[PDB]
């Protein structure tokens, strides 16, 4: 066939990546790339906040009237350390190797930035804790994560120093639209992509999940995930890993860290990746 992968395996993807045909990689990532960092999947299975209903703690209208439950939940689930995973540093290596067009992330945990992806490299489709803003439209003072953490830990509701309005993390609450950046980057990036690397997402949250259908028909798509995902739903109506018509989609099933290690090893990057992770982890462990 005219297909770009010589075989539908991780080995086939690595050979394609190091061929002249593969210049621009888009990563699509979800909570599975951060579970080994101790960040919980807010959407996965596994009280004192006295909400009118459970979903209120993540809705924008409620947050603006009663922000204390959200910031109480924030301190409770606040991670004791922000250490990106092997997967995050694999994407930094892609950037270093000149291969990363964009990382679209479902995650709000900031680990992509800590691992060295820059604003231009990222589409934080669901927002982020990395910056926060005064909610007053005429003010919009920006506050960094260090300022917000101090307010959350001292259990003081964060208020703007300029105008005393509430300060909200730049997360997309329910009732808010996705950032315009998501749609503007999608319209351009998918004209240019040679490889989709889908890591740690089961492609269940829309419109993010629809990004896989924006790839050109020839673009190979590798899923690294604990479970197979992204296939067409036999009910509702996609990834085709297993039919006789399959030609470009590959599933590597396991922990995201181990899949990225396996791919890096095939690429000849295992020592580079180990050295990067050990150095960055050491630096984070040594923060004083
Ligand atoms: C306008 C629109 O499209 N919004 C989408 C959802 C977009 C944001 C989803 N953010 C996440 O996943 C991030 C996770 C960490 S959870 C989270 C959520 C809020 C907060 Cl505040 C916090 Cl801290 C954590 C939407 O509602 N999609 C629906 C769906 N079920 O796919 C349906 C309409 O298609
Ligand atoms: Zn303000």
From Swiss-Prot:
Cofactor list: Zn(2+)
What does the UniProt entry list as the effect of changing residue 183 to A? Strongly reduces binding for the peptide inhibitor S2iL5
Q: What induces it?
A: Up-regulated in response to low levels of glucose and anoxia-reoxygenation stress. Up-regulated by trichostatin A. Down-regulated in response to high levels of glucose. Down-regulated by histone deacetylation in several tumors.
Where NAD(+) is bound, by residue?
Answer: 31-35, 41-43, 106-109, 201-202, 225-227, 256
Q: What's the record's note on cofactor binding?
A: Binds 1 zinc ion per subunit.
Impact reported for residue 59 to A = Reduces binding for the peptide inhibitor S2iL5
Species of origin: Homo sapiens
- Catalysed reaction per UniProt? N(6)-acetyl-L-lysyl-[protein] + NAD(+) + H2O = 2''-O-acetyl-ADP-D-ribose + nicotinamide + L-lysyl-[protein]; N(6)-tetradecanoyl-L-lysyl-[protein] + NAD(+) + H2O = 2''-O-tetradecanoyl-ADP-D-ribose + nicotinamide + L-lysyl-[protein]; N(6)-hexadecanoyl-L-lysyl-[protein] + NAD(+) + H2O = 2''-O-hexadecanoyl-ADP-D-ribose + nicotinamide + L-lysyl-[protein]
Q: Which family does it belong to?
A: Belongs to the sirtuin family. Class I subfamily.
Keyword ATP-binding found = no
Q: What is its EC number?
A: 2.3.1.286, 2.3.1.-
Chain's role: NAD-dependent protein deacetylase, which deacetylates internal lysines on histone and alpha-tubulin as well as many other proteins such as key transcription factors. Participates in the modulation of multiple and diverse biological processes such as cell cycle control, genomic integrity, microtubule dynamics, cell differentiation, metabolic networks, and autophagy. Plays a major role in the control of cell cycle progression and genomic stability.
Transmembrane feature ranges: none
Q: What is this protein called?
A: NAD-dependent protein deacetylase sirtuin-2
Residues binding Zn(2+)? 134, 139, 160, 163
Is Cell cycle among this UniProt entry's keywords?
yes
GO terms classed as biological process: autophagy; cell division; cellular response to caloric restriction; cellular response to epinephrine stimulus; cellular response to hypoxia; cellular response to oxidative stress; epigenetic regulation of gene expression; heterochromatin formation
State how changing residue 107 to A affects the protein, per the record.
Answer: Abolishes deacetylation of alpha-tubulin. Inhibits deacetylation of histone H3 at 'Lys-18'. Inhibits the block of entry to chromosome condensation and subsequent hyperploidy cell formation in response to mitotic stress
Q: What is its main location?
A: nucleus
User: What is the organism lineage in this UniProt record?
Assistant: Eukaryota, Metazoa, Chordata, Craniata, Vertebrata
Summarize the activity regulation: Inhibited by Sirtinol, A3 and M15 small molecules. Inhibited by nicotinamide. Inhibited by a macrocyclic peptide inhibitor S2iL5. Inhibited by EP300-induced acetylation.
User: What keywords would UniProt list here?
Assistant: Acetylation, Autophagy, Cell cycle, Cell division, Cell membrane, Cell projection, Chromosome, Cytoplasm, Cytoskeleton, Differentiation, Immunity, Innate immunity, Meiosis, Membrane, Metal-binding, Microtubule, Mitosis, NAD, Neurodegeneration, Neurogenesis, Nucleus, Phosphoprotein, Transcription, Transcription regulation, Transferase, Ubl conjugation, Zinc
Extract the GO molecular function terms from the UniProt entry: chromatin binding; DNA-binding transcription factor binding; histone acetyltransferase binding; histone deacetylase activity; histone deacetylase activity, NAD-dependent; histone deacetylase binding; histone H4K16 deacetylase activity, NAD-dependent; NAD+ binding
Where is it located?
Nucleus; Cytoplasm, Perinuclear region; Cytoplasm; Cytoplasm, Cytoskeleton
Q: What is the effect of changing residue 210 to A?
A: Reduces binding for the peptide inhibitor S2iL5
What changing residue 247 to A does, per the record, is: Reduces deacetylase activity
**What would changing residue 46 to A do, according to UniProt?**
Reduces deacetylase activity
């Amino acid at each position: 066939m005219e297909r770009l992968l010589d075989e539908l395996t991780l080995e086939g993807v690595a050979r394609y990546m190091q061929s002249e045909r593969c210049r621009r990689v888009i990563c699509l990532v979800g909570a599975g790339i951060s579970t080994s960092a101790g960040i919980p999947d807010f959407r996965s299975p596994s009280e004192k906040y006295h909400l009118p209903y459970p979903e209120a703690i993540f809705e924008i209208s409620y947050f603006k009237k009663h922000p204390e439950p959200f910031f109480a939940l924030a301190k409770e689930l606040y991670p004791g350390q922000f250490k990106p995973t092997i997967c995050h540093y694999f994407m930094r290596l892609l950037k270093d190797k000149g291969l990363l067009l964009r990382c679209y992330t479902q995650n709000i945990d900031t680990l992509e930035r800590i691992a060295g992806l820059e604003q231009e490299d990222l589409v934080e489709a669901h927002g982020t804790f990395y910056t926060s803003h005064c909610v007053s439209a005429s003010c919009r003072h920006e506050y960094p994560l260090s300022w917000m953490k101090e307010k959350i830990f001292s259990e003081v509701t964060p208020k703007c120093e300029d105008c005393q309005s509430l300060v909200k993390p730049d997360i997309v609450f329910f009732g808010e639209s996705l950032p315009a950046r998501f749609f503007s980057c999608m319209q351009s990036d998918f004209l240019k992509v040679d490889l989709l690397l889908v890591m740690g997402t089961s492609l269940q949250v829309q419109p993010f999940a629809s990004l896989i259908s924006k790839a050109p028909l020839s673009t190979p798509r590798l899923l690294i995930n604990k479970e197979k995902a992204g296939q067409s739903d036999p009910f509702l109506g996609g990834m085709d890993f297993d039919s006789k018509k399959a030609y470009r989609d590959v599933a590597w099933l396991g922990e995201c860290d181990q899949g990225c290690l396996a791919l890096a090893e095939l690429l000849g990057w295992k020592k580079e990746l180990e050295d990067l992770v050990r150095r960055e982890h050491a630096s984070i462990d040594a923060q004083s």
